[PDB]
């Protein structure tokens, strides 16, 4: 004696259903999900919208599948023609908007600061063109260093800031969520981002290769001056 699984149809055709209601429990897709329907992990079909269950076949979608849908109007018939405009319901209620306004207080009912902030302290014409190329690169290299120095000042101030906030029991401590946002704003995990750029690496690889080859030129030329004196 096992516990019965009770598989099969839980809603017959034209039966009213609201979102989440199970329509068909199955082992595998005996009936595929169709219009306004969801399939769960175990292939159970649920209504996604309020409406009436409809069992149909869509030869345009799949030649040999049978689907279950949900129509907002009991008199509608599926499958809807592919060229007809989608039938959808708003599903929203109108309410007056909020009158929220920035009214952050400074002191609690006991006269104590809500937050106390502490900061820390610690080749004729080509040469002309190449010069324009070098200047542009040198200009950006100066700008990059003129702005990377700026980022190192905002990070230092942020990571060094300490906003102590009033908590229960008249205690003053830093909240854990603010401690998390010290390293950086949410949205990405600091450290996973690649600090370097692939294009910059290629540029460095060439420069190192040039000095190496050019290094042999100077050493080879230097050796020639020593040989001239010998001869």
């Amino acid at each position: 004696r096992t516990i019965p699984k009770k598989l099969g149809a839980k809603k017959t055709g034209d039966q009213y259903v609201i979102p989440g209601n199970i329509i068909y429990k199955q082992r595998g897709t005996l009936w595929h999900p169709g219009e306004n329907t969801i399939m769960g992990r175990d292939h159970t079909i649920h209504a996604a919208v309020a409406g009436y269950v409809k069992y149909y076949r869509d030869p345009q979608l799949h030649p040999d599948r049978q689907y279950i849908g949900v129509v907002f109007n009991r008199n509608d018939k599926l499958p809807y023609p592919k060229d007809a405009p989608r039938k959808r319901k708003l599903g929203l209620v109108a309410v007056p908007r909020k009158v929220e306004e920035v009214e952050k207080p400074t002191m609690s009912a006991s006269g104590l600061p809500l937050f106390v902030t502490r900061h820390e302290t610690i080749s004729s014409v080509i040469a002309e063109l190449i010069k324009e190329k070098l200047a542009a690169r040198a200009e950006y290299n100066a700008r990059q260093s003129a702005l990377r120095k700026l980022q190192q000042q905002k990070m230092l101030a942020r990571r060094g800031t300490r906003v102590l906030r009033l908590m229960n029991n008249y205690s003053y401590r830093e909240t854990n969520w603010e401690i998390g946002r010290l390293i950086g704003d949410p949205g990405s995990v600091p450290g996973t981002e690649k600090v370097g750029s692939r294009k910059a690496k290629f540029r460095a690889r060439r420069r190192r290769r040039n000095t190496f080859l050019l290094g042999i030129k100077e050493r080879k030329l230097a050796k020639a001056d020593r040989r001239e004196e010998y001869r």
Binding site: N176, W177, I179, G180, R181, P186, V189, T192
Partner: protein, 48 residues
């Protein structure tokens, strides 16, 4: 005996942990998980 239950301790020193199973004849576990105390994804490492 073949499988052990390890504890992945947060590296934010917040005291939150995740428990996953792994075979003994394998390497220690190490994952990037969400620490609900600081509400940020940090590095979790096996306890021992």
């Amino acid at each position: 005996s073949r499988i052990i239950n390890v504890r992945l301790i947060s590296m934010a020193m917040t005291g939150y942990f995740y428990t996953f199973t792994r075979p003994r004849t394998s390497l220690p576990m190490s994952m990037l998980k969400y620490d609900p105390i600081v509400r940020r994804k940090v590095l979790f490492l096996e306890q021992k």
